[PDB]
Symmetry: D2
């Protein structure tokens, strides 16, 4: 079973499995039942921005989601990633739909990871920035229904040619190269991710959400993880 | 008076004004009496590295000081900088000696500040990195006994030609350009500073320490700030 | 008697002083009479992007100006900056209008300067990025009619309250901190500048242009350098 | 066959296949017979630094190799990479030994690639920096005799326990993720690579050299490319 650490932008509330009674953002550590959440005033049809940050000194994972001229939603949680994730991982974006749908369009995504070992200026780093996605994005591993190229955007879940979202869809996009997230000999290790999305829904209550996640290198979409499971978890435990 | 926020690498314990009975690192908010401190195993004659970080989401200021092949001292403190510092500040390094002395050599210094406002990828940033200092460092405002050029280093406090430290010396070096540390319309604001130093001392107990600070633009060394005041405070209150 | 090195986005052809008989971009070394130019299909009312680059290895200064879904204008020129500019300079943007006007709006501006001396990874660098300008931009030195704040933009030349550009106007904005552009002991020295502008003109032929420039630290707008002189030169020599 | 663009630090002169009669640095475009070379005063036993740069505006590939306190060798060549390399490539380091040997130790390696298309601040970038290599470097694809971990360095060619180099050895190390080197809709595309090496040789004339290269994603060591072929070319055409 995959080891997952994710920050979810949960648009549909599934109270039966622990979700709060409204759209929210949460920090999930190995389970879809968020260890911490915050109310999120999702704005249907508007481009928003998510920013995730973490550093080994504070051992605190935080996320801020906001829309232009609007209050931002903030969530933070104390977690020592050394004891949760393996040394090498893959980072990515996941999204899903179930009975209800929504577009899970990613317009830009950037990631920076830095490791500082016990030495002078000896800092190892990885940084990638996508402000436009091409049809053949060789450095991205697309899983499920995720596709790129449509107007230079990344569509995590299935969308029809006329532009409408489909139900029962799952898709992920992971950066090709493995990332060295931590090391026992690192004085300081830190990462930062940012991505802009566009969640549009024609129906009543949009579903299900988008999630930025970190996982074991060989992770793949668990079978039957559409809907509430966000393409990350095998069950709702 | 000046508004000061600093991270001190205090080498001499002044128990009468609140210092712990050993060398330590501390976080000072408008007072030399550190709001929080941590034991620091200072290594006389060795080059060490200090790393300070802060972000508006966690509103937590942290510092890590370490020497190659040795544990690192860490100190953190929750503080909302919007309520302590003016919108525009100047960042710098300060050091002093009193009855006892030590060299306060800075071998490198780097700083990165980022402000993200309510817009797409509209991030304002400033970054400077000095790995060598010249005799005529036009982008540094030197105050007190601070000088540059000797072997490409920055000597905060007075050192004679033969290479030995002088007592009752104070010196600071501030980056020329003002830094926009925070803004009411910022989704995320964060900064990071790093510097390597070399504290060498002929005497028994070295004194007094080095400090990375942030202050009002027009700040200058308070009178009598040699010794325990680290060139930052006018009194010990 | 300022030393000026500039890349001009010349909107009005002043053939009496050497201009080609059409809008163009040019590389000026100490004189308004460009050492090299290239035809530029200026698009009234549209946001464009200028990108300037230079490195001490090739000792070649190049610039590219372009608008979306349009051909870009390119101009390059071989010049050893060590022999033209002082070691320390200030970088900035300049603009002017004469009998004819146009708005000289700057929507963003970034600059990166790197110096690599004779040592291991010993690189000195400076980088600043403005994606939004505030009313009180303390890190910018505004000269002439230049102002900031209007919608988060930088208006190099005077614009009335309704939005119409004014004739006979000059404005410049220089980054506060001096920049160490070159050093005799540098293995590699290089810089890069990028800025987006919006030139709008209600009249027949727009005038006069915008220019990215590098100068001696104490430079200021020369007397009567409105119009064709772009706020950079004292005369048309 | 593979498409190769490389910058070689050739330590052994093979006059028969076109090499100058002294150690040199050269730019190879699809052939081991450099399109341009420059004399290189290789210093056996000392750590050196290579720096490669290129940009689509000047369409010029340049390299600078140097040792602390010594003049540097420089070589440049005009080449439009859009017409030589496929859109997606992999970048790496190669080295080989033949009848004669030398150690081809890489102590650090960094690369930055940027693509700016017809859009506002829409820049795609990739950057990685290794200042230490681990035993299990998951983001590197090691080919041939290349190994990592020995004192935190990357040994491109076979070396023994006591530290001496072996003859008839070839090794390469490519960054895991493919790199989007150019795009028809890019206003500016550029890259920069830097690496520090240590060439030590106990015998008469060291051989054969180190090379930084760019190739088609699926490139692999051609059969019998030890010696003068540098693990890059199938023959000496
Ligand atoms: C076709 C498909 O892709 N199927 C996926 C599947 O998707 C799930 C599907 O769920 C539809 C409904 O399923 C159940 O009936 C309920 O869970 C229902 O949720 C509402 O009711 C439950 C129980 O009463 C509540 O706990 C839950 O919070 C929710 O409440 C409703 O919330 C709205 C908004 O707040 C409110 O306005 C309503 O009043 C409130 N209803 C009530 C009665 O109070 C589901 O709607 O589609 C969902 C949305 O797309 C997914 O989230 C579901 O997962 O999932 C499985 C497993 O993950 C997958 O394998 C399958 O392919
Ligand atoms: C010349 C100059 O620049 N003067 C500065 C001046 O510098 C100060 C000066 O202080 C010297 C001594 O001053 C007092 O005598 C004491 O504060 C003494 O400190 C020891 O004693 C006090 C009081 O008993 C203790 O509270 C304090 O912790 C310290 O204790 C001693 O600590 C050592 C190490 O742990 C231990 O080995 C001893 O056993 C212990 N002593 C006892 C009795 O227990 C000072 O030494 O020089 C200092 C060092 O350079 C500075 O830190 C002082 O600031 O400062 C003023 C005001 O800031 C400035 O204006 C002036 O120019
Ligand atoms: C009020 C103010 O700010 N004054 C500035 C002043 O600004 C200058 C002013 O110039 C206006 C005209 O001045 C002269 O009459 C001419 O130079 C004229 O330029 C045209 O004519 C000359 C000479 O014949 C040509 O060499 C030149 O290319 C231009 O040609 C005309 O171009 C258009 C477009 O291509 C074409 O359609 C016309 O047919 C063609 N005319 C002819 C006869 O062929 C000036 O227009 O305003 C200018 C524009 O705003 C500025 O560029 C001028 O500098 O400048 C001084 C000194 O710099 C400053 O101190 C003063 O305050
Ligand atoms: C074991 C192995 O890995 N083999 C590789 C193989 O490696 C090659 C091998 O070459 C050894 C010698 O091979 C021939 O004898 C010559 O090419 C010789 O080179 C010298 O002589 C030629 C011809 O006369 C000159 O053109 C050439 O420049 C060189 O000149 C000598 O240079 C020195 C220094 O300037 C000077 O002092 C000498 O006087 C001068 N000699 C003369 C006669 O003038 C080779 O030495 O090992 C080499 C070094 O390790 C490799 O570079 C060779 O490639 O290569 C093949 C093909 O790539 C590979 O498949 C095989 O596995
Ligand atoms: Ca949910
Ligand atoms: Ca003290
Ligand atoms: Ca003109
Ligand atoms: Ca050779
Ligand atoms: Mn949830
Ligand atoms: Mn203290
Ligand atoms: Mn002109
Ligand atoms: Mn050669």
């Amino acid at each position: 079973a995959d080891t997952i650490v994710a920050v979810e932008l949960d648009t549909y509330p599934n109270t039966d499995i622990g979700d709060p009674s409204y759209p929210h953002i949460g920090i999930d550590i190995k389970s879809v039942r968020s260890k911490k959440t915050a109310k999120w005033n999702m704005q249907n049809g508007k481009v928003g921005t998510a920013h995730i940050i973490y550093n080994s000194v504070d051992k605190r994972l935080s996320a801020v989601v906001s829309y232009p001229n609007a209050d931002s939603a903030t969530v933070s949680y104390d977690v020592d990633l050394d004891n949760v994730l393996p040394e090498w991982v893959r980072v990515g974006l996941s999204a899903s739909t179930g009975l209800y749908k929504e577009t899970n369009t990613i317009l830009s995504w950037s990631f920076t990871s830095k490791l500082k070992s016990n030495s002078t200026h000896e800092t190892n780093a990885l940084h990638f920035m996508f402000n436009q996605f091409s049809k053949d994005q060789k450095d991205l591993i697309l899983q499920g229904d995720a596709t790129t190229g449509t107007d230079g955007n990344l569509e995590l879940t299935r969308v029809s040619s006329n532009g409408s979202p489909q139900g029962s869809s799952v898709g992920r996009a992971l950066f090709y190269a493995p990332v060295h997230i931590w090391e026992s000999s690192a004085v300081v290790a830190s990462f930062e991710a940012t991505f802009t999305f566009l969640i549009k829904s024609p129906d009543s209550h949009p579903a299900d959400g988008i999630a930025f996640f970190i996982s074991n290198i060989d992770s793949s979409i668990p079978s039957g993880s559409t809907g509430r499971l966000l393409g990350l978890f095998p069950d709702a435990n």
